[PDB]
Design a protein around this ligand. Sequence first.
Ligand SMILES: CC[C@@H]1CN2CCc3cc(OC)c(OC)cc3[C@H]2C[C@H]1C[C@@H]1NCCc2cc(OC)c(OC)cc21
Length: 129
Amino acid sequence: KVFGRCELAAAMKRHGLDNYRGYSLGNWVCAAKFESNFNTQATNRNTDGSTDYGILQINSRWWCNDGRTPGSRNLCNIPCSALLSSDITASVNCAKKIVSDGNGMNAWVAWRNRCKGTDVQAWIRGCRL
Ligand SMILES: CC[C@@H]1CN2CCc3cc(OC)c(OC)cc3[C@H]2C[C@H]1C[C@@H]1NCCc2cc(OC)c(OC)cc21
């Protein structure tokens, strides 16, 4: 599923991301834009053998099991395929654990490099939320 901007903002808000760990909703929408271009089915293979899955490109070395990431953990206790669903619940629940790992949303390098310090509220303006 390719979410619309405002559609995804609404779904993230219903699942509790607005101001989660202090990050306003626009930060989450911006991160999804530059991680996945709002495409729940996005995957990207890393040179180290791990794979990033879904709307927030969550990585298999620590956070989900895909059965092909040597030496990995599964700290969100989910199959990585669950992060590709049109229902974003599993991605949101796992993202909540990630943003708690001490680096906040710097855990998403695309957030740090492309969203951090910008007018992220522009991502939710004009959205019914
Ligand atoms: C309501 C307008 C969209 C919302 N903004 C949020 C702020 C923002 C920040 C960006 O980088 C930090 C950014 O980079 C790509 C985009 C945005 C936008 C996205 C807006 C515009 C919109 N995106 C989908 C379709 C489209 C097509 C466009 O031209 C064909 C266009 O021209 C300006 C804008 C957009």
